[PDB]
């Protein structure tokens, strides 16, 4: 079919969990879920001592530039 | 670790057009759909 589609769908999965139900909202768009989510967590974690701030700092880059990238298709 | 890797890896696939465009268009209600019939 498409593997194309399924490594969207696995990437996905990696933000929103089979541990299913912290779920995400059906209306957004895969990226803008993705996105929300991985500002959410980064916050949480750099907080809670799971990441170090090097790692936060480019989390939450990272994240500026895909929502560049969204912005322009 | 995790949230690197999958950051990363999101910004690979916004990085080449097809999936850049599955990602942005696709609603994540979609998703089951889609899916079914994959």
Same mark, same amino acid.
């Given at each position: 079919? =498409?593997?194309?589609?399924?490594? #969207? #769908?696995?990437? %996905?999965?990696? %933000?929103?969990? +089979? +541990?299913?139900?912290?779920?995400?909202?059906?209306?957004? +768009? *895969?990226?803008?879920?993705?996105?929300?989510?991985?500002?959410?967590?980064?916050?949480?974690? %750099?907080?809670?001592?799971?990441?170090?701030?090097?790692? %936060?700092?480019?989390? *939450?880059?990272? #994240?500026? @530039?895909?929502?560049?990238?969204?912005?322009?298709? | 670790?995790? +949230? *690197?890797?999958?950051?990363?890896?999101?910004?690979?696939?916004?990085?080449?057009?097809?999936?850049? =465009?599955?990602? @942005?268009? @696709?609603?994540?209600?979609? *998703?089951?759909?889609?899916?079914?019939?994959?």
């Amino acid at each position: 079919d =498409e593997q194309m589609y399924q490594r #969207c #769908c696995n990437l %996905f999965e990696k %933000f929103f969990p +089979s +541990s299913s139900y912290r779920r995400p909202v059906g209306i957004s +768009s *895969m990226v803008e879920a993705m996105v929300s989510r991985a500002r959410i967590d980064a916050r949480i974690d %750099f907080e809670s001592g799971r990441i170090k701030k090097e790692e %936060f700092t480019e989390i *939450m880059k990272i #994240c500026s @530039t895909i929502e560049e990238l969204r912005r322009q298709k | 670790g995790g +949230s *690197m890797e999958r950051i990363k890896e999101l910004r690979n696939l916004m990085s080449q057009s097809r999936t850049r =465009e599955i990602l @942005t268009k @696709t609603t994540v209600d979609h *998703m089951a759909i889609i899916k079914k019939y994959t």
